Design a protein around this ligand. Structure first.
Ligand code: CLA
Ligand code: CLA
Ligand code: CLA
Ligand code: CLA
Ligand code: CLA
Ligand code: CLA
Ligand code: CLA
Ligand code: CLA
Ligand SMILES: CCCCCCCCCCCCCCCC(=O)OC[C@H](COP(=O)(O)OC[C@@H](O)CO)OC(=O)CCCCCCCCCCCCCCC
Ligand SMILES: CC1=C(C/C=C(\C)CCC[C@H](C)CCC[C@H](C)CCCC(C)C)C(=O)c2ccccc2C1=O
Ligand code: SF4
Ligand code: SF4
Ligand code: SF4
Lengths: 88, 42, 143, 80, 743, 157, 154
């Protein structure tokens, strides 16, 4: 029946429509590879700190060491400074 | 006939007649006394 | 004394092909509603959400997403057809709460078992100024 | 939930209850008018705040008042 | 089932009694005003017939006679145009020297200083230059003298009288029965074969007997007074035969199927006549003939009284499939019951048609000396775009009125409509997404270009010189049209339109008429803007229709009507949930879309098309081909289009164009005036009015008709009406001053 | 015979069944995407997702970026894709921190389409989500690196 | 003169404006045959221009450096024609209109359906009342004194 006060998940359509539920198609040794190597990143708070500080310092690095051949803002003006309307 | 005079007394029709008369009047006054920034007769 | 009729599952539902207007996750984790009515025949009626459905002869059960949808459809059932309806609130635990008609009497007909709620015994203009209830949790209309 | 109140200027014409689209209001017995009935708001947790009742009241000034207050899923009319 | 003439005698008595009872049609309004709101309702409900009565026959009779009233007004208006062409026009002088004289059909009285608007239009004539196009029509019709225009104005006036009479007659004397109106097969058969077919055939007749020869004498430089009268070509066939020898046969090749011998005056050349810059009149007469045949055939599709032919209900019911259920079953019953349904489809198709007309008339100028008159061409395109857009928003409004008022699944069911209603959330959600995607990937590209250009990075823009977004598909299409003549249209001498085929630039009086229109990144970006704006308009209107009945927010919405302000501050607030308010909101977006379209037209035509040509063939365009490099940026629209081309209208004071300066400023004024209504609400105004009313009662001058602020809905309607009038008239003055000065 | 039916037979659950929604090709393909492998450790599914996406992001950044026409650094514009992997991994992390508490069970459905009881996906747990985020980061950085490793013999480098 | 202005009869800029206007209209006039109707129209505009500037010069209008009349509204008796006198005329007419409309509203206020005569004008009553505005200042002054002008306790 489509209405049952005992099972409301069925009654309210709370299903996994495309969930496979099959076992892993990933073979092991590959799995153990990624399980041992991605393990340090599976602590969400620690990962948040590593991303904010790591990405932040990374940004600071590529910003501090940028070359004028990449950014015109580091290259600076290369022309003789022009003259204002009435002033300098 | 009575109903037609009544219709001609209704707000929009009386308004068109009234303002049309007023417009003809003001137009003719500006036709015989054009321009005029002032009341010149003092 | 009035005894609310219990919600009977296995009650048939109207003939309808489905719509995008029906239930969502709200019905699974929060609440939904159920309106039941007795029909003399198979009729076509407008669904408060989709298009057209076929009311079945006999008891009809219809799960809706909001109370207002139950009351709208019920208003129409009582108006266009001449059909008695009830409806309930249903929580995800399976618990059912009978809602309407609360007394078995429609609320526009005065019934003596009814207790006053939110009734203030004064003209509306005699409410006090806000300053007189300031810093107290009260509102001048709560009196 | 929105607050809804009735005032004893009510004449018991039942139109606020008839107008309400969520069944918030009832008619209860009373001795203060000829119709011997006064409105009541026992189910304001279902009140959506549309003020159809206020549109329906013939009393001057109104005898139903809807004071829109703390919002809920029911008061915002959400089907989701 | 036997189609026949059906009417009733004297249904309504002709009397002035109800002229004197305002609001006689409504049982509430007829009681007269207690407040000023009455006065507005009387006008808002005047034409809402199906709100006055529920009897379909009475409604149909009102509709029919009303159409007669409309046609009477149209004939009176045409009578005006022809009469002004005869009595207050320089049409003969222009008829001599079209490439110089400016068409003028209105003269103003010298009262208050306004005679300055009577400007030098040529031909020793002072007046207002007209952009309607009547001179090119009258020339294309062979009309020479003012007298002929007089006769046409008199005939038009007579037909105004006849139409008005028939309206009174078929409402008060012989009023058709409801079955008469519902005879749809008869109506379609007579409008396909009788109206369109015999009309097109009649016009082909006038053209082959009047337009073609008289235009031959005009094109040969003959003086119009020396040109034979149009009936002299009907009498002495030697005049025509000298011009068109085929007329010596006596229509024997027509019956003997020797029709190829008529290739003299019936032609498939295509392109433009290089003398007049308009389409070949031989091609046009041939065209009206072919159209006549096609419609005369199409008018026999539907069965009436003789068993042969189609019933439309049969055709509908046969069309159903695995995705749509029983679809089309029930539509004959809906379309023969609901006027609003018919008006919805007809508004949609008639507006879409008007827009198609707008394109085809510029890309294929049908009248002589029309292409080079840039004021008339810009005016025509812009005008018909506006008509089309308005009509389409109307189609949405009446689809909504159908949904609210005439929709009933328990009586007149349709499977297609039910299924649509059954996934309205999917439809509207997907349209929403497409609108967002189009917004970003059309307008966001403009913002990208403005930001790159401001930062000094024009190589990082979207441009023909940087990151090219070529309209490859459209370019391929216009190439295929260019190659069509001789290949996929061997009968066609030249390209279908000079916008396709390379070369063959056409110039008249030193001014260009048409040349191949280039397409590039600028045109790409603009076209996606048009896609975007249209999709958002469709979103607002379609959403209005599909949720007019109900929604998750308001399950009983149809009980609140088609036009209602809201259902109150609750549920978070429900303002503008009505389908009416969706039409209100969609009007602004039709204004936006059509505005960008006509700006695109003016900009592109002045930049890449219009201009003057040298004796040695060097073309100087009105603007310096600056569309490709200046339109790809919003700043370029502000600067090189608006700021530049507004100089004429802000410099028009002291000339005959100063009226366009005045209308420029005044239309700005009414547009800003609309913002008072659109940004506020009637509660404030009603309170203020309470104070003003106090002041009047103090002096015993308070009126009995109690003053009230406008309704919420009326506030919106006033608002959008002034917004649209102000914006549209502003662009009007801008365009006309610009193109009359520099064209 | 009609193609559109109500969802899972219940015509009052708000959806429909179409060739787009319920189709053997569609159902198999969606069931075989990592996000829908409910019994697999979320870390591995995050690895696959990150590999695919991180690999994908390299293209638009390099070809459309500001250094695109300076082939000396234009190729190295993949750092931007790496940074977007970092930002997305932050978004994932704070999504899980906000959405799931330490000891709460999965919020995924524990039923199948046919009504039988199912074991809910651990992706919808705090630990499972943290694992999927770590996997998406690892696989994403790795996929960017793999795409950048290939600069050669491609019609659009 | 007043406010540093000069009489327009003495203003070079004023005469330069009249000259440039007339020569402009004559530039338009050179295009048409002198017997033609456009010609006669431009001649009429020219005569009307001369009448305009000559009248402004005569009636004592002061001019700015712009060569255009400026109006002295201070009340200086040399310029009452520029505001005070047309102003009194205006107040007479406006008082007339308002007094007549008020008379109509008072006349219909005790009718069985007052609004009925507000949307359909009782033209006989209106014609009876229009000429009360001729003496509106005496009528309104007398009402102010008698206490019939203002409603009591409002
Ligand atoms: C106000 C602060 C700010 C700053 C400092 C920047 C800085 C930059 N922007 Mg951005 N931008 C901003 C605001 C800002 N933007 C806003 C508000 C918007 C929305 C309108 C944009 C939208 C925008 C766009 C669309 C683009 C830029 C681009 C750029 C880069 C252009 C210069 C360049 O070519 O360098 C060098 C170029 C590189 C590709 C080097 C990559 C830099 C590495 C990856 C840094 C590592 C990031 C770090 C690990 C993670 C950061 C998050 C951190 C907090 C954890 C530059 C580094 C361009 C760009 O990034 O190119 C793709 C570009 O496409 N910006
Ligand atoms: C010639 C005399 C005549 C008379 C005395 C009547 C009498 C009557 N008619 Mg009839 N009718 C007539 C002619 C006449 N009609 C004509 C010529 C037509 C064809 C259009 C009709 C078609 C017709 C219909 C369809 C209906 C009536 C109705 C009625 C009755 C309602 C009262 C009324 O019409 O108020 C109306 C008063 C008016 C002043 C109407 C003016 C409308 C004009 C035509 C619009 C003009 C357009 C204007 C120029 C737009 C520019 C505006 C611009 C300046 C801003 C009434 C007894 C109605 C009815 O049956 O009542 C229940 C009804 O529905 N008549
Ligand atoms: C409150 C704003 C305002 C004011 C104070 C004026 C004032 C004036 N205008 Mg202007 N005007 C205005 C707004 C205004 N206007 C607007 C909005 C427009 C656009 C529609 C115009 C367009 C306009 C034009 C085109 C012209 C004027 C003219 C005039 C002058 C005409 C005097 C006259 O008619 O002779 C005297 C009139 C009377 C004495 C009539 C009263 C007598 C009554 C009817 C009977 C009395 C019986 C006792 C006058 C000084 C005219 C002019 O020549 O300017 C110098 C003229 O050409 N106005
Ligand atoms: C060949 C026959 C024929 C023709 C030419 C027309 C023509 C027209 N019809 Mg009609 N109609 C017909 C038969 C015909 N109808 C039939 C068989 C039915 C079903 C029974 C209808 C029912 C119908 C309805 C319900 C309506 C129309 C309308 C219209 C007008 C649409 C607007 C337009 O195109 O204006 C173009 C203008 C012209 C072409 C000018 C020429 C018009 C001449 C004077 C009329 C010629 C045909 C006429 C029916 C002859 C009868 C006259 C005689 C009885 C005295 C149009 C003039 C609308 C309308 O009535 O508008 C007022 C409308 O509402 N028709
Ligand atoms: C042949 C096409 C057609 C037809 C016959 C109808 C017919 C109808 N419409 Mg529809 N509609 C149309 C086109 C059409 N419409 C278009 C193009 C639009 C887009 C704007 C709409 C949008 C629309 C809406 C939103 C509504 C209708 C409504 C109605 C009904 C009421 C009409 C009425 O009494 O209003 C009376 C007419 C007036 C009060 C005139 C108003 C004056 C306008 C706003 C100003 C015009 C400005 C002027 C042209 C320029 C300035 C001049 C000025 C300075 C003097 C009626 C049956 C109404 C309804 O309730 O349906 C039942 C309604 O709400 N229509
Ligand atoms: C210029 C004023 C303006 C703007 C920007 C919009 C914007 C929008 N309208 Mg609105 N509208 C307006 C005027 C405006 N409207 C007015 C005056 C009315 C009254 C009639 C309406 C009434 C109206 C209705 C009824 C509807 C819309 C809809 C929409 C949306 C269309 C979908 C879209 O294009 O998405 C894309 C967004 C844009 C094109 C805006 C610019 C995007 C910029 C360039 C991107 C910059 C991003 C950058 C990274 C910012 C980050 C910086 C950081 C510091 C945060 C859109 C967001 C429709 C809708 O809901 O959407 C489907 C809808 O139905 N509008
Ligand atoms: C791909 C689109 C396309 C389009 C829009 C046209 C359009 C046209 N072609 Mg055509 N044609 C095409 C492809 C196309 N053609 C190709 C690829 C070839 C081979 C190279 C031809 C060869 C061809 C010939 C030989 C002729 C035309 C002709 C015509 C014109 C009259 C149509 C006609 O003959 O009636 C319909 C013809 C039928 C056989 C009935 C088919 C029913 C259709 C589908 C409706 C017309 C404007 C005629 C012409 O030159 O007119 C001046 C003509 O004689 N075409
Ligand atoms: C405008 C967006 C954009 C851009 C600039 C690129 C650019 C690029 N892609 Mg990508 N791609 C995109 C969208 C985009 N792609 C999308 C939406 C998908 C689906 C998710 C893919 C999936 C995809 C894959 C699987 C691969 C690329 C690859 C490539 C690179 C070389 C292949 C090539 O383009 O030659 C021509 C490609 C043909 C298929 C022909 C190239 C720099 C290849 C790569 O990165 O090499 C290592 C690679 O294998 N793309
Ligand atoms: C026109 C192309 C549309 C093709 C629809 C394909 C098509 O024609 O299929 C036709 C399909 C078949 O229906 P039936 O076989 O039941 O039709 C039989 C009867 O209805 C007609 O007698 O109808 C549908 O699939 C329902 C519509 C759902 C599809 C909604 C998608 C809408 C998106 C379209 C916009 C994207 C392209 C826009 C380009 C202009
Ligand atoms: C200004 C404004 C008003 C006030 C505007 C009103 C009341 C318009 C009506 C004004 C006219 C002038 C009243 C008509 C007076 C009669 C025509 C009599 C005139 C007498 C002669 C001159 C004809 C609203 O009522 C309102 C309501 C809802 C949203 C926005 C607004 C809003 O913005
Ligand atoms: S505001 Fe609406 S829902 Fe609330 S009591 Fe009044 S009518 Fe009922
Ligand atoms: S509308 Fe007013 S008077 Fe009537 S029942 Fe409700 S509260 Fe009482
Ligand atoms: S503000 Fe006006 S439109 Fe909005 S909900 Fe309130 S009454 Fe309705």
């Amino acid at each position: 029946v489509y209405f049952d006060l005992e099972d409301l998940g069925n009654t309210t359509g709370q299903w996994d429509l495309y969930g496979s539920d099959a076992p892993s198609p990933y073979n092991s040794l590959q799995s153990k590879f990624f399980e041992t190597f991605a393990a340090p990143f599976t602590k969400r708070g620690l990962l948040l700190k590593f991303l904010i500080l790591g990405g932040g310092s990374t940004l600071a690095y590529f910003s501090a060491t940028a070359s004028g051949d990449i950014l015109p803002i580091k290259k600076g003006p290369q022309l003789p400074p022009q003259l204002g309307p009435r002033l300098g | 006939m009575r109903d037609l005079k009544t219709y001609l007394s209704v707000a929009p029709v009386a308004s068109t007649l009234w303002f049309a008369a007023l417009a003809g009047l003001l137009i003719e006054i500006n036709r015989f006394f054009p321009d005029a920034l002032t009341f010149p007769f003092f | 004394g009035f005894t609310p009729p219990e919600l009977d599952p296995n009650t048939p539902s109207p003939i309808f092909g489905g719509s995008t207007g029906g239930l969502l996750r709200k019905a699974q984790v929060e609440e939904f509603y159920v309106i039941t009515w007795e029909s003399p025949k198979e009729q076509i009626f407008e669904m408060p959400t989709g298009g057209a459905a076929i009311m079945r002869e006999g008891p009809n059960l219809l799960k809706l997403a909001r109370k207002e949808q139950c009351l709208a459809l019920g208003t129409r059932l009582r108006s266009k057809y001449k059909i008695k309806y009830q409806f309930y609130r249903v929580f995800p635990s399976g618990e059912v709460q009978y809602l309407h008609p609360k007394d078995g009497v429609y609320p526009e007909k005065v019934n003596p078992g009814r207790q006053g709620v939110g009734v203030n015994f004064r003209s509306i203009g005699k409410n006090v100024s806000p300053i007189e209830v300031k810093f107290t949790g009260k509102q001048p209309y709560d009196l | 939930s929105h607050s809804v109140k009735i005032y004893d200027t009510c004449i018991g014409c039942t139109q606020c209850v008839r107008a309400c689209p969520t069944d918030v209001l009832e008619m209860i017995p009373w001795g203060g008018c000829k119709a011997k009935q006064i409105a009541s708001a026992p189910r304001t947790e279902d009140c959506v705040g549309c003020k159809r009742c206020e549109s329906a009241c013939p009393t001057d000034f109104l005898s139903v008042r809807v004071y829109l207050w703390h919002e809920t899923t029911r008061s915002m009319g959400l089907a989701y | 089932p036997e189609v026949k003439i059906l009417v009733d005698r004297d249904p309504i008595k002709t009397s002035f009694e109800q002229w004197a009872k305002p609001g006689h049609f409504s049982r509430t309004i007829a009681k007269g005003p207690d407040t000023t709101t009455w006065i507005w309702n009387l006008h808002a409900d005047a034409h809402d017939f199906d709100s006055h009565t529920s009897d379909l026959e009475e409604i149909s009779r009102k509709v029919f006679s009303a159409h007669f009233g409309q046609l009477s007004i149209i004939f009176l208006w045409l009578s005006g145009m022809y009469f002004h062409g005869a009595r207050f026009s320089n049409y003969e002088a222009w008829l001599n020297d079209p490439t110089h004289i400016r068409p003028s059909a209105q003269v103003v009285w010298p009262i208050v200083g306004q005679e300055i608007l009577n400007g030098d239009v040529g031909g020793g004539f002072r007046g207002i230059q007209i952009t309607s196009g009547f001179f090119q029509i009258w020339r294309a019709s062979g009309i020479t003298s003012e007298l002929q225009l007089y006769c046409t104005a008199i005939g038009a006036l007579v037909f105004a009288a006849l139409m008005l009479f028939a309206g009174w007659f078929h409402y008060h004397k012989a009023a058709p029965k409801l079955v008469w109106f519902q005879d749809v097969e008869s109506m379609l058969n007579h409008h396909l074969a009788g109206l369109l077919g015999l009309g097109s055939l009649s016009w082909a007749g006038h053209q082959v007997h009047v337009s073609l020869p008289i235009n031959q004498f005009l094109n040969a430089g003959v003086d119009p007074k020396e040109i034979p009268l149009p009936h002299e070509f009907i009498l002495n066939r030697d005049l025509l035969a000298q011009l068109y020898p085929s007329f010596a046969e006596g229509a024997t090749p027509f019956f003997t199927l020797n029709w190829s011998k008529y290739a003299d005056f019936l032609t498939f050349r295509g392109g433009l006549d290089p003398l007049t810059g308009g389409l070949w009149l031989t091609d046009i007469a041939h065209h009206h003939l072919a159209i006549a045949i096609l419609f005369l055939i199409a008018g026999h599709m539907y069965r009436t009284n003789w068993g042969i032919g189609h019933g439309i209900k049969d055709i509908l019911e046969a069309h159903k499939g695995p995705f749509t259920g029983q679809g089309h079953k029930g539509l004959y019953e809906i379309l023969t019951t609901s006027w609003h349904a018919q008006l919805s489809i007809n508004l949609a198709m008639l507006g879409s048609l008007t827009i198609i007309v707008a394109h085809h008339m510029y890309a294929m100028p049908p009248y002589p000396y029309l292409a080079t008159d840039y004021g008339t061409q810009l005016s025509l395109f812009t005008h018909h775009m506006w008509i089309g857009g308005f009509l389409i928003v109307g189609a949405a409004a009446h689809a909504a009125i159908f949904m609210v008022r005439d929709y009933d699944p328990t009586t007149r069911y349709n499977d297609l409509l039910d299924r649509v209603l059954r996934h309205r959330d999917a439809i509207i959600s997907h349209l929403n997404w497409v609108c967002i995607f189009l917004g970003f990937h059309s307008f966001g590209l403009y913002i990208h270009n403005d930001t790159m250009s401001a930062l000094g990075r024009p190589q990082d823009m979207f441009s023909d010189t940087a990151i090219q977004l070529q309209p490859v598909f459209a370019q391929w299409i216009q190439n295929t049209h260019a190659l069509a003549p001789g290949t996929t249209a061997p009968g066609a001498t030249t390209s279908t339109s000079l916008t396709w085929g390379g070369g063959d630039l056409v110039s008249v009086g030193g001014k260009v008429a048409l040349l191949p229109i280039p397409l590039g990144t600028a045109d790409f970006l603009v076209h996606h803007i048009h896609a975007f704006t249209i999709h958002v308009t469709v979103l607002i209107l379609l959403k209005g229709v599909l949720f007019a009945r109900s929604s998750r927010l308001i399950p009983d919405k149809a009980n609140l009507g088609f036009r209602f302000p809201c259902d109150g501050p609750g549920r978070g607030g429900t303002c503008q949930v009505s389908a009416w308010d969706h039409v209100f909101l969609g009007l602004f977006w039709m204004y936006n879309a059509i505005s960008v379209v006509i700006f695109h037209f003016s900009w592109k035509m002045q930049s890449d098309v219009w201009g003057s040509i040298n004796d040695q063939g060097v073309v100087t365009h009105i603007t310096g081909g600056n569309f490709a490099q200046s339109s790809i940026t919003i700043n370029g629209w502000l600067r090189d289009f608006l700021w530049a081309q507004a100089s004429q209208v802000i410099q028009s004071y002291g000339s005959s164009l100063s009226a366009y300066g005045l209308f420029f400023l005044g239309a700005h004024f009414v547009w800003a005036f609309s913002l008072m209504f659109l940004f506020s609400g009637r509660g404030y105004w009603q309170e203020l009015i309470e104070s003003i009313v106090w002041a009047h009662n103090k002096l015993k001058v308070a009126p009995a008709t109690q003053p009230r602020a406008l309704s919420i809905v009326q506030g919106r309607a006033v608002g959008v009406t002034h917004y649209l009038l102000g914006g549209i008239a502003t662009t009007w003055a801008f365009f006309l001053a610009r193109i009359i000065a520099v064209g | 015979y009609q193609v559109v039916q109500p969802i899972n037979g219940d015509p009052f659950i708000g959806s429909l069944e179409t060739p787009v929604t319920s189709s053997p090709l569609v159902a198999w393909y969606l069931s075989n995407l990592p996000g829908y492998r409910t019994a697999v450790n979320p870390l591995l599914r995050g690895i696959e997702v990150g590999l695919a996406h991180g690999f994908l992001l390299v293209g638009p950044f390099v070809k459309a970026g500001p250094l695109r026409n300076t082939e000396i650094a234009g190729q190295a514009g993949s750092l931007a894709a790496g940074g977007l992997v970092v930002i997305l991994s932050i978004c994932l992390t704070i999504y899980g921190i906000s959405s799931f508490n330490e000891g709460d069970p999965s919020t995924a459905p524990s039923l199948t389409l046919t009504g039988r009881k199912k074991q809910p996906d651990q992706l919808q747990t705090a630990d499972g989500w943290a694992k999927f985020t770590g996997g998406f980061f690892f696989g994403g950085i790795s996929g960017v690196i793999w795409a950048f490793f290939l600069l050669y013999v491609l019609d659009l480098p | 003169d007043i406010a540093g202005l000069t009489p327009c009869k003495d203003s070079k800029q004023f005469a330069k404006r009249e000259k440039q206007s007339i020569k402009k209209l004559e530039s338009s006039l050179k295009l048409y045959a002198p017997d033609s109707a456009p010609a006669l129209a431009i001649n009429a505009t020219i005569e009307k221009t001369k009448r305009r500037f000559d009248n402004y010069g005569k009636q004592g209008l002061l001019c700015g450096a712009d060569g255009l009349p400026h109006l002295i509204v201070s009340g200086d008796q040399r310029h009452w024609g520029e505001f005070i006198t047309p102003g009194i005329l205006f107040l007479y007419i406006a008082g007339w209109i308002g007094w007549v409309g008020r008379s109509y509203l008072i006349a219909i206020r005790d009718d069985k359906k007052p609004t009925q005569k507000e949307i359909i004008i009782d033209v006989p009553l209106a014609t009876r009342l229009v000429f009360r505005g001729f003496s509106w200042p005496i009528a309104a002054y007398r009402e102010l004194l008698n206490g019939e002008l203002v409603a009591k306790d409002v």
